[PDB]
Fold this protein.
Amino acid sequence: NKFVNTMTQKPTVEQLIPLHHWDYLYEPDAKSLLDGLLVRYVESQVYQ
Amino acid sequence: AGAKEIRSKIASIKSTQKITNAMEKVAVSKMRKAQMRMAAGRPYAERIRQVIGHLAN
Amino acid sequence: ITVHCDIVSAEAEIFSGLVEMVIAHGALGDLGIAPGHAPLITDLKPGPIRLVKQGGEQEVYYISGGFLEVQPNMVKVLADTVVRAGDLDEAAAQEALKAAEKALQGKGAEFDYSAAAARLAEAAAQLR
C-alpha cells in the first residue's frame, strides 16, 4: 500500500526485477559491480 | 428493562469510548514516526538507480 | 578546497558535510579522495573510513561494507547496515525457506478467496 495522503491508502502492484557523456573508472570488474548493485537496489525497494 | 442495567451499559460504552479516542492519537504519532522513517531511505535508492542507469548505458 | 560528502545507509544517514580528504578501504587497496578527482565506482570491504576537515582531521566512521562513487564535485558513500558475506546471508535464506508455513497443499485455483473477500468488503462499509 502506497501513502497517497493521511486519508488514502492505495493498493498497487509494482514490478521489481525488469528495470553526461563521461565514464566511471572501475576499481574491480564492473560486471561484479552490476551484480552487487542490482541486488542492493531490489533490497532497498522492498524495504521502502 | 430497569434503569440500572441501562446505566451500567452506558458506563461501559463510555469507558470504551475514551480509550478508542486515545488510541486514534497513538496511531497519529506512530504514523508520523513511520513517515520520518519513510523519508530517510530515498537518497540511497535514487543514487543507486542513477548509477545503475548510467552503467547500463 | 572542499567537496561535499555523504555517507548514506539504506535506512538512515550517517554523514553529510564538506570535507577535504577521504581515506577508504577499496576492493583492491586502500585509496584516498581529493576534490577534482576522477569519477570512480568501487566496492568496499568492512573497516573504518577516515574523513579529514579543517580541525576535524580524524573524523572516523566505521562502515561494514558497501560502495563508493566519486564525481569531481560530489562524493557518495553508499554503506551497509551489516557485513555482507555468504555465511551470514545464506543462513538468513535458509531461515526464510524453513519458516514458510505450509498447512495444506492447495492447487491455487480456488474460488473461496472472493467468496470470503466480497462479504468482508461489504461488511467494512457498515462500520464507517
In short: Helices of chain B lie at 3-38, 42-55. The two ends of chain B are 80 Å apart (CA to CA). The interface with chain C takes residues 37, 40-41, 43-45, 47-48, 51, 55 of chain B (CB under 8 Å).
